[PDB]
Amino acid sequence: LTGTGVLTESNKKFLPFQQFGRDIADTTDAVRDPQTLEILDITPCSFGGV
Amino acid sequence: QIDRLITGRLQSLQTYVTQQLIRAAEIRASANLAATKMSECVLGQSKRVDFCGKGYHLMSFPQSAPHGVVFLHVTYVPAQEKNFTTAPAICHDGKAHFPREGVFVSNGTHWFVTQRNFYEPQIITTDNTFVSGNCDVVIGIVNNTVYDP
Amino acid sequence: SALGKLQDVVNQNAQALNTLVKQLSSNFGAISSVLNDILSRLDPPEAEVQIDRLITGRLQSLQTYVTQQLIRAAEIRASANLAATKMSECVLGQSKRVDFCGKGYHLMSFPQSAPHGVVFLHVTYVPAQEKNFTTAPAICHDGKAHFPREGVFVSNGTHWFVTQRNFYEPQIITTDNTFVSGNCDVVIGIVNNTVYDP
């Protein structure tokens, strides 16, 4: 699963069979690191209007 | 393949912008109505029927709401109406008397003049009536005395 | 920037026309944006594909232009219905509607033609130079309560008068500008003053 984002620590406690996380709009906003079983939030990079 | 995705996403975005423009026109019409109600019901007393609530409009109060405005219309509703026998004019001394501001009412034996939206009977005098013509023209004129102060 | 509302409509229409003219310069994925170049360069089996791409791009552009033209036509029709209402109610009559025909108490209005528009000169009455007075709802006299027929009871400190509500014009409180309803025991804030009889 590839993408671009800021990977921060997450307070969402996954069940052990679940790997990724999706919001209402079906975008991957939570993920599990495969090396160390920890949950990371994927915040989109902070683009804006100039 | 990217051209197919581009034309699909462009069609989706054009559809979204078109329906957003239609909803923006609807919201602009509603906001013009809300500004009209702000000017005519809050900043003044409106004679327009059902524009500022049901009943005779007294005043209105604005309240902010999330993406909206709430008008509290304070209105006057008449209640507890009562039957009376009425006449268009009073015949006295060969003259026809008509109410200056109110209406002639009778409870069965005596004739009074009252304001139209509330029962407040007063003695029919020359100060609340005016004279126009004789009694031969007005259909339904009745005979009653007219007091002179 | 006084005439910005008409100039906004003119600029939007001219910009929509300029965008529609500019959209002919785009090839929309074809080899060229010029139809004569495609028709002079290619056989009809592949010129059909190139012309089809140009046709669907230009048709999408034209349908988009007609869509915002209809939306702007609805907006201009709403503004013109409002302008016709203002012409009927402010110019051809005197309006009791607050802020419909200018700021203040509306007296009359003048229409003026403008390029693709109308300018209303609203002549209104603004109150000014207000003054404090001590006021009462009613006058108690001879055990009777007197209320103003059209004005309001005011006092400059020692003497009571009745005046019209939108302009200070003090007059002697008489039986001709007051009416009697009830005694003095009911009305809250009734004051004692004489009522002259002509």
Added chain:
Amino acid sequence: YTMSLGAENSVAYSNNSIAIPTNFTISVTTEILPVSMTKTSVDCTMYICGDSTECSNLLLQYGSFCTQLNRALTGIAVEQDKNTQEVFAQVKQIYKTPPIKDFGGFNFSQILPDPSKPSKRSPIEDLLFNKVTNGLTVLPPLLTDEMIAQYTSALLAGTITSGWTFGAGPALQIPFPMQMAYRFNGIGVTQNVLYENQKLIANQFNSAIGKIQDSLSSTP
């Protein structure tokens, strides 16, 4: 079923009888009107293509579609702020009520701002705010909810302390049982009726304002 419009009310018409009201009800009703929407802005290039440069190179063949979409959304976004400006900013003087709320028995605590709340909203406005629950950006509105509440507070203070005079010029103070009498004369009822029954009208008005708050709190 076949629906029924309304209860039949045969009005007792005759050529010499009239019905005159002997009493009145001070009725307060709510009217809710939308003013603005959420100001949304879409980056057309990022929505179609994201960060793919080949996609944007192919998107440049279609011309200025993205510019038209961005300009239409910008027009909608400034139209929402213009709508809020036309609705709420109808006064250029910020009026305040006096600290003593002596209005001849009339209670406005449910519509005046609450000093105990940090949002400076009325209890009714607080209940109203409680009852409402890829290139995409949401632009904030130009007027915050605190300033819209301040505008409504100024309008309420003007219409309570000064009548309709502040909407036509300078705010001319007038006692509220006199303002009410003027409104009574605007609908064709004499001033005496208001003055004699001022306690009953104030009680009816306060009861109706409380019923408005109860009906808003009890209807989803």
Added chain:
Amino acid sequence: TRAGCLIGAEHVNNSYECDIPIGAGICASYQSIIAYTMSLGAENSVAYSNNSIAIPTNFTISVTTEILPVSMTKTSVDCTMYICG
């Protein structure tokens, strides 16, 4: 700001009328470029009491302008000629 980061404008504590809207109550003006929270209106406390009234002694005849658009330029596009010539 709540609208975003503003670079090149000096934030001041005074409140003025809105000249250039930034958003979330922030406006910008030129005087250098300053940014501020807007002022809604001039403050005015109405001298309310239960037995005092204010009566006007004079008047101003005020004429104001109201500009309303009526029509647009009547444009017609030959669809066949626009697409194909």
